[PDB]
Design a protein around this nucleic acid. Structure first.
Lengths: 169, 243, 534, 126, 158
RNA sequence: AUCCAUGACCAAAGAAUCGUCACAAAUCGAAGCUUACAAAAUGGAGUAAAAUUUUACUCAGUAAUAUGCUUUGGGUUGAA
């Protein structure tokens, strides 16, 4: 036979969690504030190291060895924190448990790691990511005139993440 | 839809009023929960069931839901509700719940000792039951106590909030959740979230796995935040016909 | 008006006193010049009608030309466009002008009742490649030129070219000089040294008298909505070779024909005529063997057990342990016997009764007290009266315009009178997927409110539809019909079936709902039925 | 003159059309019994595979019952989706059959008549 | 609240079932907002349609309004006709017939069209879900003369 | 000339039904609900009021009901 696989698409949300801010309330501003980029101190190695730390403490040897057999980080972007990870089909829930029970990546603090979808093939998570980015761009360009979000935290990024690092067939 | 119904309201008793920073924190955490996917939310409130309830029929629910949060029920579609978490310790001290029934939608109970726990399942007016998963539940609880209430219209609740704060509370949480699952034979379980901060919230498609790898069947993990949590809210709202 | 005919063809036998008729199947009759007729028939009923005409060959004349005329059927939108890309004429004829103009419709339902074409083509092997009719120039066809097609009809030019098919020596002359492939190749090669010297043509020219002319007829069938093309036999192969070089032309078999005629809510002569002498055989003698042979030839336990099924009906009669009727076919004999017995059980006692607990066991007395007695009578009549001997009867007539509904110790047999039925199509309002031979029950007067509420919609607190409830069940005397063809209907997106139901059942329903359940299952789905005018 | 006492059967025909394999793949005929989300999904999936046909717009198109339904869909694409649409009002002519007017069946004589209605074409850009 | 129309994210107090009030609001609120300044006024004889009409008299009125007994050396006869909801089907029966007999004297005519929408919020399936609907709005300008100094870039010319 | 038990060889076939799984899009995947209309376009049918015109209404019932409904996914007439 052939070995199955599962791909997990994880984002990183950086909530403000600071007092004396009194933000505005609108679907555009909440997303535009929670979705700031990553401070570039995180890397492809920091996330993997932290997700290995969170398994050998919230699970034991027989929980940190049934997942570490096949666990590879494929694609990660800093302009938008989306990333893709790969694991065995029967041992994907333990990786999710590692995801939630883990915060404070490396030294960066006050953040949430958010797995948004899991799927078998790799051809389909690409389409899902494209649809997700299209949906975000549509919702940010409809609240008002789009260029009131002129800071361009993410607007120039979705178009330019087309296939630059996504040629992993 | 998704229902999360254990967001706490920052007030300890009927004496103090709410400050500014507390409500400022509450609004931010509500916004974050709205982003993560939740649509319907309820707001908790803790008392001791042995205190002087306001005599007048008003100002007994200081939530003030229609003036505050008026700019969040529009500009984004999430809806909000109200609930109170009575703490029962003694089999006496009156104050029968016929009074506060009209001023809320969801009434819960948080028994502490054996007498309180056996009173709670005996004859009250609650529509939900909760425990203190933080530490030191009164152990050796069996199907005998819980069968009678769950046969009637009562539900059990898990919070998963204490799994995020500290390791020492995490161990007690994971110890007690297994007992409460296996004592009720996986019947009438719903999930809330104790979010004291805009950091202690989580998505859906992982917490279901967090409950599935503890003992709950995968067929029931998909109805905690769902049909049962919708039915409790539907009944609570339909109770408002007292007027 | 010489429009095509499609209907039902009988077999009259009026020659000595008592006579009757029995439906046989479909028929295509086309009249010409008021004293010539062309008849097209399915092969199975070809001979039986034919010999009938031979009873009067003193007065008529008949030609079994089934080995001399061929035909092709075309379906789709871009059909005439593809056929017109492989046909040219010899002279100028108006019936080719009309054919050129009407080959640009793409929605053939707009055209009127009659669209007959008839002309004389040349050997289609001249072209060497299909070619358009230069049609892109004219693109302002409107609804005013269509009305001209009902007045500018070339009657004589159709008759003259048509009468070169109803004469054997004329279509014999039609072969007068049929060319071999090599000499056509040489003729084409002779076009590289032509006199115009500024043309570079590919199609070979046409000679005035040293080449054959092929008569050709094209007719339109409205009920089936397709095009017939009728041609001489040996000419079919040269044409059919070009017609399959179109980049988007596909050939279909006989199953696809059944599916196409199923989708358009229409019957199908072989499989779906249980009131004809051959449909009955195909149902109760040909499908049943093909199914049972592959059933009883499986190890037990690796197949659906038919007489061990629980909770089929509200209350259980001890006659049938499990399922009702034969497991492999739509059994109509049981329907006739059961319905007739149910009707007789209400001769003067309106209130039926199911079973009396152990009255007795049985002049060969077979009393008609309880409904279990009717069921055991049906069980006795099978496997012990027609599995060891033969008998023929048509328990299934078709709906008649007259009115002979009602009826009633001399002649009270349960297999003597035919029970009239009608043909319907049932669509499912909720989940379901009706396969073949499934059963159709009337909706009980009790629980009508529950099924109506389910039809309107019952929603969970979540907001979706509510499905998992308590499904109530009807009795066994609520069986009124069978389903003969059913699958997922792509034209509407929900499952649909076609079948027959007892006539007297429908004319007493206070509503328009029925219950459908497959064979070997106890799940009842809801549906609504509409009539088919056949 | 004559009052139209034609309660006898009338077999309405679809309007005469003509297509070119380019209007086949860039056109939608909104029926009266079309569920809203059905046409929504159909339109949403043609604006993704129309560039390869060398076009720049999709022609939603309807009359009678469809018009308001059609217009509703247009609204959903004007705002809340941020696309530009053009609206054209058209007149259409269709054909109806009427009988010429023992007991005989449906198969009676036929005469054609012409009747006009009005509809809307609505072009949604990309 | 969960009731009432919402035109341009702003609550309004009027009922869809009644047509006259909605037509009045649509006439005196949004039409000047789309058809911009025309020297503070232009000869525009407003006309609203409803599902209860008689098409002959309405097309006669539309014929009259575009010719005030052949005004000489005056302003332009610009007409604006609008409708919404289930009444729209009645408007296109008029707007086309009026154009049919008017071109029997080999004269030309120019029109512009524009489409907008009302939003409506109502109770959904159960008491926990809201549902929101869209209602169409169609406005059309007919001129009888060439391009006008008014600002019409969103409109569509036919 | 009969039966039972063990063993060898040949041959047939490789279970059916019901329920749940968050997003103006979803799921571990796929598909369906596009021959534009209620004969209200020989320039629809009627009711009320005021000096043909102006102002108010009735008539469309399988009516229509909004990211909604329905079907299906390892050897389909064993070996992919």
């Amino acid at each position: 036979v052939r070995l199955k696989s599962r791909y997990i698409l994880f984002e990183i949300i950086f909530p403000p969690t600071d007092t004396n801010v009194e933000e505005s309330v609108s679907k555009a501003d909440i997303l535009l504030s929670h979705h700031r980029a990553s401070p570039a101190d995180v890397s492809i190695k920091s996330i993997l190291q932290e997700i290995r730390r969170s398994l050998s403490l919230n699970l034991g040897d027989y929980g940190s060895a049934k997942c570490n057999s096949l666990l590879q980080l494929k694609y990660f972007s800093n302009k938008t924190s989306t990333g893709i990870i790969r694991c065995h089909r029967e041992d994907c829930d333990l990786v999710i448990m590692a995801l939630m029970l883990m915060s404070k990546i490396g030294d960066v603090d006050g953040l949430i790691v958010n797995p948004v979808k899991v799927s078998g093939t790799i051809k389909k998570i690409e389409q899902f990511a494209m649809r997700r980015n299209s949906k975000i761009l549509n919702i940010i360009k409809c609240s008002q005139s789009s260029h009131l979000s002129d800071n361009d935290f993410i607007i120039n990024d979705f178009k330019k993440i087309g296939r630059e690092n996504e040629n992993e067939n | 839809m998704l229902v999360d119904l254990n967001v706490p309201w920052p007030q300890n008793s009927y004496a103090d009023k709410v400050t500014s920073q507390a409500v400022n924190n509450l609004i931010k955490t509500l916004s974050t929960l709205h982003m993560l996917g939740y649509t319907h939310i309820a707001i908790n409130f803790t008392v001791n069931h042995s205190e002087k309830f306001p005599n007048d029929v008003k100002l007994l629910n200081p939530i003030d839901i229609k003036r505050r949060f008026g700019e969040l029920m529009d500009r984004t579609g999430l809806k909000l509700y109200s609930r109170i978490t009575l703490i029962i310790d003694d089999p006496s001290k009156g104050q029968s719940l016929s009074k506060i029934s009209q001023a809320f939608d969801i009434v819960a109970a948080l028994p502490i000792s054996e007498k309180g726990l056996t009173l709670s399942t005996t004859n009250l007016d609650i529509d939900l039951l909760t425990f203190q998963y933080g530490s030191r539940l009164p152990t050796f609880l069996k199907h005998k106590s819980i069968c009678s209430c769950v046969n009637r219209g009562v539900k059990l609740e898990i919070v998963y909030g204490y799994a995020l704060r500290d390791v020492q509370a995490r161990r007690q949480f994971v110890s007690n959740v297994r007992s409460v699952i296996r004592s009720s034979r996986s019947r009438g379980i719903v999930i809330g979230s104790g979010a004291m901060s805009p950091l202690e919230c989580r998505n859906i498609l992982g917490v279901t796995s967090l409950i599935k790898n503890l003992g709950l069947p995968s067929d029931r993990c998909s109805k905690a935040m769902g049909d049962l949590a919708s039915l409790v809210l539907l009944n609570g709202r339909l109770r408002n016909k007292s007027h | 008006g010489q429009v095509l005919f499609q209907g039902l063809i009988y077999s009259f036998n009026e020659e000595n006193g008592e006579d009757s008729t029995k439906p046989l199947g479909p028929c295509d009759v086309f009249w010409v010049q008021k004293d010539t007729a062309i008849i097209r028939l399915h092969p199975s009923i070809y001979t039986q009608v034919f010999n009938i005409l031979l009873q009067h060959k003193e007065k008529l004349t008949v030609q079994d030309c089934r080995y001399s005329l061929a035909s092709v059927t075309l379906k789709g939108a871009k059909a005439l466009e593809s056929l017109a890309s492989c046909l040219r004429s010899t002279e100028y004829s108006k019936s080719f002008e009309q054919f050129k103009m009407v080959s640009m419709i793409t929605d053939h339902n707009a055209l009127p009742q009659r669209c007959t074409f008839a002309f004389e083509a040349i050997d289609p092997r001249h072209l060497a490649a299909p070619k358009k009719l230069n049609d892109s120039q004219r693109k302002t066809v409107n609804s005013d030129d269509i009305l001209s097609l009902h007045e500018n009809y070339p009657q004589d030019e159709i008759n003259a070219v048509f009468n070169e098919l109803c004469d054997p020596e004329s279509r014999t002359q039609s072969y007068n000089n049929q060319n071999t492939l090599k000499e056509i190749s040489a003729r084409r090669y002779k076009l590289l040294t032509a006199t115009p010297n500024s043309i570079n043509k590919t199609t070979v020219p046409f000679k005035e008298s040293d080449d054959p002319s092929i008569p050709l007829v094209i007719i339109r069938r409205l009920k089936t909505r397709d095009w017939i093309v009728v041609l001489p036999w040996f000419w079919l192969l040269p044409l059919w070779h070009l017609l399959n070089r179109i980049p988007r032309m596909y050939h279909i078999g006989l199953r696809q024909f059944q599916q196409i005629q199923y989708e358009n809510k229409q019957l199908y002569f072989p499989d779906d005529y249980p009131f004809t002498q051959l449909g009955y055989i195909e149902n109760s003698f040909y499908k049943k063997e093909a199914s049972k042979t592959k059933w009883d030839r499986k190890p037990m336990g690796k197949r659906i057990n038919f007489e061990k099924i629980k909770d089929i009906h509200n209350t259980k009669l001890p006659a049938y342990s499990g399922e009702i009727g034969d497991f492999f076919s739509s059994d109509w004999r049981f329907l006739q016997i059961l319905r007739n017995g149910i009707d007789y059980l209400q001769r003067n006692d309106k209130t039926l009764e199911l079973m009396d607990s152990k009255k007795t066991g049985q002049q060969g007395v077979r009393d008609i007290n309880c409904v279990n007695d009717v069921l055991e009578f049906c069980k006795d009549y099978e496997a012990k009266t027609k599995a060891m001997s033969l008998s023929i009867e048509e328990n299934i007539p078709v709906a008649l315009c007259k009115n002979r509904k009602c009826q009633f110790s001399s002649s009270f047999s349960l297999t003597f009178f035919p029970r009239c039925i009608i043909a319907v199509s049932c669509t499912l309002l909720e989940r379901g997927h009706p396969k073949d031979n499934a059963r159709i029950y009337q909706v009980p007067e009790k629980d009508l409110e529950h099924w109506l509420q389910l039809a309107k919609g019952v929603y969970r607190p979540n907001g979706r539809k509510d499905h998992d409830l308590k499904i109530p069940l009807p009795e066994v005397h609520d069986l009124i019909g069978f389903i003969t063809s059913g699958t997922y209907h792509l034209n509407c997106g929900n499952g649909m079936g076609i079948g027959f139901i007892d006539h007297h059942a429908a004319i007493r329903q206070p509503t328009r709902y029925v219950l459908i359940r497959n064979v070997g299952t106890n799940t009842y789905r809801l549906g609504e039925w509409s009539k088919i005018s056949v | 003159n004559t009052h139209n006492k034609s309660t006898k059967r009338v077999t309405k025909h679809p309007s005469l059309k003509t297509l070119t394999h380019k209007q086949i793949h860039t056109t939608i005929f909104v029926k009266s019994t079309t569920p809203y989300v059905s046409a929504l999904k159909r339109i949403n999936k043609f604006l993704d595979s129309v560039h390869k046909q060398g076009s720049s717009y999709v022609a939603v198109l309807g009359m009678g019952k469809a018009v308001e339904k059609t217009l509703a869909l247009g609204c959903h694409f004007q705002d809340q989706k941020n696309k530009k649409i053009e609206v054209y009002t058209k007149t259409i002519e269709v054909l109806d059959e009427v009988i010429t007017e023992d007991v005989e069946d449906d198969d009676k004589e036929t005469q054609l008549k012409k009747r006009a209605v009005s509809g809307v074409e609505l072009r949604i850009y990309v | 609240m969960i009731n009432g129309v919402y035109y341009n994210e702003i609550s309004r107090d009027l009922d869809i079932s009644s047509s006259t009030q909605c037509l009045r609001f649509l006439k005196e609120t949004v039409i000047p907002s789309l058809a911009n300044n025309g020297n503070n006024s232009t000869s525009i004889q407003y006309h609203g349609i409803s599902k209860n009409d008689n098409i002959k008299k309405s097309v006669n009125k539309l014929d009259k309004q575009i010719n005030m007994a052949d005004r000489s050396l005056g302003l332009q006869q610009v007409v604006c006709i609008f409708s919404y909801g289930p009444h729209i089907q009645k408007m296109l029966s008029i707007l086309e017939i009026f154009k049919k007999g008017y071109i029997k004297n080999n004269k030309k005519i120019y029109q512009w069209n524009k489409l907008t929408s009302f939003d409506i919020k109502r109770e959904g399936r159960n008491e926990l879900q809201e549902e929101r609907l869209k209602v169409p709005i169609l406005v059309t300008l007919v001129s009888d003369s060439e391009i006008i100094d008014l600002n019409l870039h969103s409109f569509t010319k036919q």
